[PDB]
Design a protein around this ligand. Structure first.
Ligand SMILES: [Mg+2]
Ligand SMILES: [Mg+2]
Ligand SMILES: [Mg+2]
Ligand SMILES: [Mg+2]
Ligand SMILES: [Mg+2]
Ligand SMILES: [Mg+2]
Ligand SMILES: [Mg+2]
Ligand SMILES: [Mg+2]
Ligand SMILES: [Mg+2]
Ligand SMILES: [Mg+2]
Ligand SMILES: [Mg+2]
Ligand SMILES: [Mg+2]
Ligand SMILES: [Mg+2]
Ligand SMILES: [Mg+2]
Ligand SMILES: [Mg+2]
Ligand SMILES: [Mg+2]
Ligand SMILES: [Mg+2]
Ligand SMILES: [Mg+2]
Ligand SMILES: [Mg+2]
Ligand SMILES: [Mg+2]
Ligand SMILES: [Mg+2]
Ligand SMILES: [Mg+2]
Ligand SMILES: [Mg+2]
Ligand SMILES: [Mg+2]
Ligand SMILES: [Mg+2]
Ligand SMILES: [Mg+2]
Ligand SMILES: [Mg+2]
Ligand SMILES: [Mg+2]
Ligand SMILES: [Mg+2]
Ligand SMILES: [Mg+2]
Ligand SMILES: [Mg+2]
Ligand SMILES: [Mg+2]
Ligand SMILES: [Mg+2]
Ligand SMILES: [Mg+2]
Ligand SMILES: [Mg+2]
Ligand SMILES: [Mg+2]
Ligand SMILES: [Mg+2]
Ligand SMILES: [Mg+2]
Ligand SMILES: [Mg+2]
Ligand SMILES: [Mg+2]
Ligand SMILES: [Mg+2]
Ligand SMILES: [Mg+2]
Ligand SMILES: [Mg+2]
Ligand SMILES: [Mg+2]
Ligand SMILES: [Mg+2]
Ligand SMILES: [Mg+2]
Ligand SMILES: [Mg+2]
Ligand SMILES: [Mg+2]
Ligand SMILES: [Mg+2]
Ligand SMILES: [Mg+2]
Ligand SMILES: [Mg+2]
Ligand SMILES: [Mg+2]
Ligand SMILES: [Mg+2]
Ligand SMILES: [Mg+2]
Ligand SMILES: [Mg+2]
Ligand SMILES: [Mg+2]
Ligand SMILES: [Mg+2]
Ligand SMILES: [Mg+2]
Ligand SMILES: [Mg+2]
Ligand SMILES: [Mg+2]
Ligand SMILES: [Mg+2]
Ligand SMILES: [Mg+2]
Ligand SMILES: [Mg+2]
Ligand SMILES: [Mg+2]
Ligand SMILES: [Mg+2]
Ligand SMILES: [Mg+2]
Ligand SMILES: [Mg+2]
Ligand SMILES: [Mg+2]
Ligand SMILES: [Mg+2]
Ligand SMILES: [Mg+2]
Ligand SMILES: [Mg+2]
Ligand SMILES: [Mg+2]
Ligand SMILES: [Mg+2]
Ligand SMILES: [Mg+2]
Ligand SMILES: [Mg+2]
Ligand SMILES: [Mg+2]
Ligand SMILES: [Mg+2]
Ligand SMILES: [Mg+2]
Ligand SMILES: [Mg+2]
Ligand SMILES: [Mg+2]
Ligand SMILES: [Mg+2]
Ligand SMILES: [Mg+2]
Ligand SMILES: [Mg+2]
Lengths: 118, 204, 122, 59, 137
RNA sequence: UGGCACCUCGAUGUCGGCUCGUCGCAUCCUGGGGCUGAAGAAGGUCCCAAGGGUUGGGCUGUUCGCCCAUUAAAGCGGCACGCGAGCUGGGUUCAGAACGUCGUGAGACAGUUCGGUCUCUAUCCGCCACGGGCGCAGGAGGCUUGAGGGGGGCUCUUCCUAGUACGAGAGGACCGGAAGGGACGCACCUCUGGUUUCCCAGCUGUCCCUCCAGGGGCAUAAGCUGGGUAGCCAUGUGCGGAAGGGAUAACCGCUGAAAGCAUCUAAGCGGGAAGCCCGCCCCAAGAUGAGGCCUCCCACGGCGUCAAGCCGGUAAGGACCCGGGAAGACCACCCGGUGGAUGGGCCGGGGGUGUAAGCGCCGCGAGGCGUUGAGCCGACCGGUCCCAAUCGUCCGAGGUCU
RNA sequence: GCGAAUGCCGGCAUGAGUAACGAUAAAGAGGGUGAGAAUCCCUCUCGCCGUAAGCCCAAGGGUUCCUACGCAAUGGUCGU
RNA sequence: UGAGGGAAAGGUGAAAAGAACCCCGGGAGGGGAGUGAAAUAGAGCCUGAAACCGUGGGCUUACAAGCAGUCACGGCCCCGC
């Protein structure tokens, strides 16, 4: 009855949810900004902020913990070598979520526009 | 009839001389009184308390604007505690004494649209032995032609919980004076954060 | 916490080894049975040369359960297997050597000759 | 044909009364702080684009 | 500060935090006891402790022992007034902190899976406290 | 069990069981009382009393009935022999087949046995819950009395009085007190035990990242095993029934004529039950009989069929939108919206998991040691404005009459 | 000469914006075409079959094959 | 499979004189303009009913219970000197 469970259940199962966050992490870290639905985004921010806080260390083990959920070495070296320096003067919350209008025609779902903070 | 506004903060065990007591720590702090009733004005003669502090900008002022007593308006429901009579400033915990039986009236947890087996403790059909779809159903709800209609209160599914629930005859274990806390003996209605009123139990 | 159709293991030397209890003596509908509780058991298997044969309907007291005994100080205790001692109709054990450990609630619930007979009372 | 069936048909005073609740509400339309068009709150003005920051792409 | 461990720290002003920390190894535990009116006869109880469910003030642990062919295990609150809790042989090697698998196999192969430690023996004998500084001068 | 054949042959599903109840008393117990062939206990019978209970099993398809262990009791009935738009199909009322009997035979048997399709969508009334509109004769924010309605309305054992009264003795109370239980109901997760779906660790096979190492996917919609915090529960914990008042039924009376005596009654006054109403708790002013109290705002800003009942903004307020919540199907309720800790991230604490990767040493190697209670963290509790509630928009009385 | 025949034929209702939308193998993201894209084309990830959910024939079906132009109708939604 | 069973589907206008052209709209669909006696005579288009679905006006309904009707009193609205 989830009297305290956060969850964010998304009409999928566990491996589809974790592999979905694996896919949106790669698609958000490849091009920066992203556009998706709202409840997938409002929990995906808690995953990408976890990856960037595990990118602030950079000590050969947190690299492996980034590689547990980001299987592209070229994307991880781009993450550490192009994203990790310019966020070091910011403490937490490295991702902004701004809701987008003009909902989809076939679905009627509200849109979310989620990008890296400048 | 002594009473206080309180709020659940959690429960634990205390240790007496031989037996442990499943206490509930409960924060019944300094409660400002705002209004007294009168037999010559309303008759039932209760006293209106309010307890937890509010910054004066979320108010809307039919509420902001009570007179001299408790100019700083509280947050929660201004509960009248049914013929209790303080001196006029506030009601502390030292009105209560350890070893007295105190009533706790709060607001229990609503389970949502709770089922009939979880709600009214039925038995239902078996899992095996050919049972089509009866595994959690209540079953029969009446009779044929006479009487016809289903009687009122047939104890079916609905909103179980989220109502005002009174748990009675709780003995006071310990009093904390510096933070104005109470230690009742377990089974308080309400979640961590649910406001209660704590009266005197009768049980004469 | 033993129920109907339960195989209590006899911790006594009255001949019985494993018994099956049916009705608990507490009231109208005794659902469970704690430690220190008089039950009625039929004897399934016995050792020879004993006064308790197979199929006897005797009374007993429960001395060990796998379900815990909750001591009133907050503490608790569990055992390894269910055990009973063959009591009579006048609350006296028929055997003069009880096997293994027993509980402490037998003392405060009446029985002294059983607890004084048990070697290591827990 | 199976276990639930309508015994009698619903008339105009009952069909045209059960439809009375589910009607479309007018969507709230606050003015855009830069654009001279209407838009629902807490989302992007489709011509403004958040004071021309992360906007619908301009030249 | 309305809720949390500062309110739950007020009812922890009688805590007994001088008793030593212990991993799941062999130990002996004495306890107060009330029987026959008088509160005397503290009782010792050795064995291997299985589960360490530490939770704030009201922590719990369970000491199992083999007693006359019967596995008897015991649920202790660690803060009720038990006098001494001294560890006989600090075996340990708790690869699993919840070693519930022992209750199936009751035989000599307990200590081949629960081997004697060396580390806590080393800082135990190195932390033996026997430094005669009291009234030494 | 019958008799009748009055609606039902364009059909009203038949026995039994499970779940779910409700009602009557002609009461099985618990509560009172009279009589007794009532010495006491245990009894028998009758009157009042339906408030609450009426077990767990074996046998047969069984209702019933016979036995085991208990209890104070394992009551009798109705509600389409309650209940198949709830379920079961064991028997009977389908087609197969066989046994015994009858019949030349086909077949039949209120005789026996094996097997044998039980029909997803609620239109209206009813019921359980939650809402929208309007009303409550000015508009709102709260607090709250209670006309009325349901829940609970249990009950046993041990000890003192007391081995006293009584009885030759065996036996063994009434009155009152103390403690502990069996079932049911409410609340909680601190103790005990569960679940906890990717929180942690280990492991097998294959494939992939990059060869080693280290990782990822699949083997469930968890790949298996061991744990597992918060939350949700009971197997756990704390409570409940009352204590007390009034009128009472059966019954026991006081005074007292009719009927100079007598009499509980004809006037009156009493005692007298788990029964009734009080009392406890919630529901509750849609109790139009629409209650009561505190606080905020209020004449025109134009004119009728005149203080809006002809209209546009607006005061108090409310609504839309967003963050959310042990609040929740949707709705609704509650806390916030830069004057903020409401959610996410981070930090600190609690807690789960158990010595992370890498380095150095030993060993041919699998593996073991120090770095290390380290590394990893879903919820529990605080702090931090780093990000998201930015901007905002729309309704809203203008104070009728005796 | 119609109101009945569980009459027939044609239209429109109730059921109702209700059930369902057809194996619980699984989708996500960035560009392009286009007035209009969760559904069309390309690219990067994830999953499924792989004694087939792969390939080759005979049955059977009869232009369903390819290209170009379009969405009147069909595709259990949209669809360029 | 086959023997066989077996439909519905007529109407513009005298003459297509079948709506050139402008605008919205992707198109469809129309709004104008024009032909036409008539364009609610617009291309399966003569007349075009009823069931059915709506829009606009008058009356009445949020304390009343009925196979929904009839009679009476009254109020409101619309015709008629
Ligand atoms: Mg949460
Ligand atoms: Mg779905
Ligand atoms: Mg809830
Ligand atoms: Mg069940
Ligand atoms: Mg099933
Ligand atoms: Mg079936
Ligand atoms: Mg009736
Ligand atoms: Mg209508
Ligand atoms: Mg702590
Ligand atoms: Mg009859
Ligand atoms: Mg006749
Ligand atoms: Mg019919
Ligand atoms: Mg029939
Ligand atoms: Mg029949
Ligand atoms: Mg009677
Ligand atoms: Mg009788
Ligand atoms: Mg009696
Ligand atoms: Mg007697
Ligand atoms: Mg009754
Ligand atoms: Mg009854
Ligand atoms: Mg039936
Ligand atoms: Mg049926
Ligand atoms: Mg039925
Ligand atoms: Mg059958
Ligand atoms: Mg069958
Ligand atoms: Mg046959
Ligand atoms: Mg279905
Ligand atoms: Mg309904
Ligand atoms: Mg309402
Ligand atoms: Mg109220
Ligand atoms: Mg009332
Ligand atoms: Mg009423
Ligand atoms: Mg009542
Ligand atoms: Mg727990
Ligand atoms: Mg748990
Ligand atoms: Mg794969
Ligand atoms: Mg595969
Ligand atoms: Mg899987
Ligand atoms: Mg799978
Ligand atoms: Mg007299
Ligand atoms: Mg009388
Ligand atoms: Mg009387
Ligand atoms: Mg009386
Ligand atoms: Mg926050
Ligand atoms: Mg810690
Ligand atoms: Mg720890
Ligand atoms: Mg740490
Ligand atoms: Mg963390
Ligand atoms: Mg932490
Ligand atoms: Mg999670
Ligand atoms: Mg948290
Ligand atoms: Mg928090
Ligand atoms: Mg702080
Ligand atoms: Mg006709
Ligand atoms: Mg019909
Ligand atoms: Mg027809
Ligand atoms: Mg709907
Ligand atoms: Mg539906
Ligand atoms: Mg429906
Ligand atoms: Mg559906
Ligand atoms: Mg699906
Ligand atoms: Mg896509
Ligand atoms: Mg796109
Ligand atoms: Mg584009
Ligand atoms: Mg897609
Ligand atoms: Mg061919
Ligand atoms: Mg074909
Ligand atoms: Mg073709
Ligand atoms: Mg083409
Ligand atoms: Mg198309
Ligand atoms: Mg289509
Ligand atoms: Mg096109
Ligand atoms: Mg002309
Ligand atoms: Mg025209
Ligand atoms: Mg025209
Ligand atoms: Mg037409
Ligand atoms: Mg046409
Ligand atoms: Mg003509
Ligand atoms: Mg026509
Ligand atoms: Mg209309
Ligand atoms: Mg009325
Ligand atoms: Mg009215
Ligand atoms: Mg009438």
């Amino acid at each position: 009855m989830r009297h305290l469970k956060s969850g964010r259940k998304l009409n999928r199962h566990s491996s589809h949810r974790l592999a979905l966050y694996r896919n949106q992490a790669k698609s958000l870290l490849t091009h920066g900004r992203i556009t998706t639905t709202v409840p997938k985004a409002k929990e995906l921010r808690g995953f990408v902020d976890h990856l960037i806080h595990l990118a602030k260390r950079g000590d050969l083990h947190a690299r492996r913990l980034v590689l547990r959920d980001l299987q592209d070495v070229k994307l991880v070296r781009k993450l550490f070598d192009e994203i990790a320096p310019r966020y070091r003067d910011r403490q937490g919350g490295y991702t902004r979520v701004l809701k987008l209008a003009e909902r989809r025609r076939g679905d009627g779902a509200p849109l979310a526009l989620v990008e890296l903070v400048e | 009839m002594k009473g206080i506004l309180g709020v659940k903060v959690g429960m634990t065990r205390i240790f007496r001389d031989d037996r442990a007591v499943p206490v509930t720590v409960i924060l019944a702090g300094p409660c400002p009184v705002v209004q007294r009733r009168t037999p010559e004005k309303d008759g039932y003669t209760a006293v209106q308390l309010g307890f937890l502090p509010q910054n004066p900008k979320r108010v809307n002022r039919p509420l902001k604007g009570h007179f001299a007593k408790a100019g700083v308006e509280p947050v929660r429901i201004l509960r009248e505690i049914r013929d209790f009579n303080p001196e006029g400033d506030t009601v502390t915990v030292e009105i209560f004494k350890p070893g007295e039986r105190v009533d706790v009236t709060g607001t229990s947890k609503g389970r949502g649209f709770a089922g009939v087996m979880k709600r009214w403790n039925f038995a239902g059909g078996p899992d095996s032995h050919g049972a089509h779809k009866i595994h959690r159903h209540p079953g029969s709800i009446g009779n044929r032609k006479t009487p016809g209609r289903v009687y009122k209160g047939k104890k079916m599914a609905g909103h179980y919980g989220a109502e005002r629930v009174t748990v009675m005859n709780l003995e006071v274990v310990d009093v904390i004076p510096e933070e104005n806390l109470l230690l009742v003996k377990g089974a308080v209605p309400g979640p961590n954060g649910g406001l209660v009123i704590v009266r005197e139990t009768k049980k004469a | 916490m033993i129920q109907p159709q339960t195989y209590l293991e006899v911790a006594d030397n009255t001949g019985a080894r494993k018994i099956m209890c049916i009705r608990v003596l507490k009231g109208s509908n005794a659902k469970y049975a704690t430690v220190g509780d008089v039950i009625v058991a039929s004897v399934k298997e016995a050792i020879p040369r004993g006064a308790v044969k197979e199929g006897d309907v005797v009374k007993a007291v429960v001395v060990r359960t796998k379900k815990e005994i909750k001591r009133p100080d907050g503490s608790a205790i569990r055992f390894d297997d269910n055990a009973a001692v063959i009591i009579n109709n006048q609350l006296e054990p028929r055997g003069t050597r009880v096997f293994g450990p027993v509980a402490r609630e037998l003392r405060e619930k009446g029985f002294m000759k059983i607890v004084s007979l048990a070697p290591e009372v827990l | 044909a199976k276990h639930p069936v309508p015994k009698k048909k619903t008339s105009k005073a009952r069909r045209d009364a059960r439809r009375s609740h589910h009607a479309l509400t007018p969507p709230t339309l606050v003015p855009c702080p830069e654009c001279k068009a209407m838009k629902p709150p807490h989302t992007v003005c489709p011509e403004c684009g958040y004071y021309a920051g992360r906007k619908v792409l301009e030249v | 500060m309305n809720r949390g461990a500062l309110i739950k720290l007020v009812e922890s002003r009688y805590v007994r935090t001088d008793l030593p920390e212990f991993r799941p190894g062999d130990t002996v535990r004495v306890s107060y006891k009330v029987k026959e009116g008088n509160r005397t006869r503290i009782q010792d109880f050795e064995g291997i402790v299985i589960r360490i469910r530490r939770n704030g003030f009201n922590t719990t642990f369970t000491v199992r022992k083999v007693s006359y062919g019967v596995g008897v295990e015991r649920i202790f609150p660690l803060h009720s007034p038990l006098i001494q809790k001294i560890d006989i042989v600090q075996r340990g090697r708790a690869r699993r902190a919840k070693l519930y698998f022992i209750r199936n196999l009751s035989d000599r192969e307990i200590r081949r899976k629960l081997r004697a430690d060396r580390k806590r023996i080393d800082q135990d004998r190195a932390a033996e406290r026997a430094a005669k500084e009291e009234a030494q001068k």
